[PDB]
Each structure stands twice: as C-alpha cells, then as structure tokens.
Ligand binder design. Structure first.
Ligand code: NA
Length: 102
C-alpha cells in the first residue's frame, strides 16, 4: 500500500485563523468559469505575513478541493467565501498544487 507519493501534488493543510483571517485570496466558483480551464476555487494571493504565509504550505495557484472535508465543487464563489468564514478557528484544506497542461 503506497502512502508516499513520488510527486507530491496534493496535500492536506491544517491552518489556524489569524486576526486578519486565513491570509489568502480566492478566485473561481461555478459562476467564474472564465478563471480556469479546470473549474474550482483557486488561491490567487498569499497575503504577506498572514496565517497561510507563515504556515508555508499553501501556494498561489493551488486549487482548493475541500474545506473541512466539504467539496468545493458545485459552489458559487460567494458560497465558498461563506464556507471559509463559517469554518472556525482550525481549518483543514485539501489542495492540488499547480499542474500545467502542455
Ligand atoms: Na498569509
């Protein structure tokens, strides 16, 4: 049973909220099909000195698959925003790091 990937492209990241939030910006959603050829919620910016920045693992361009196990597929942009806001202090993200079609 493989529990170690040759290439680590997907990752679970456990963040804790700071005073300014989780410390990243998102784009995407079912109402933002123009953003990507692979619809979902993406990290557009890691905020300088914020929670996500200090933690080190989240990257700009990450696709966030789920928050606390809740799939972000099928969500409007605003519905994703509300989810993050509703997630409490500790937040578990499952992400797919950037992968480019050539
Ligand atoms: Na940050």
């Amino acid at each position: 049973s493989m529990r170690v990937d040759y290439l680590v492209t997907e990752e679970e990241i456990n963040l804790t909220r700071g005073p300014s939030g989780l410390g990243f910006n998102i784009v995407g959603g079912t109402d933002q099909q123009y953003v990507s050829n692979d619809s979902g919620i993406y990290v557009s910016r890691i905020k300088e000195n914020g929670a996500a920045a200090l933690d080190g693992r989240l990257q700009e361009g990450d696709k966030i698959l789920s928050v606390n196990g809740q799939d972000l597929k099928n969500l409007l942009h605003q519905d994703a925003v509300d989810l993050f806001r509703n997630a409490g202090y500790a937040v578990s993200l499952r992400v797919q790091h950037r992968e480019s079609s050539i």
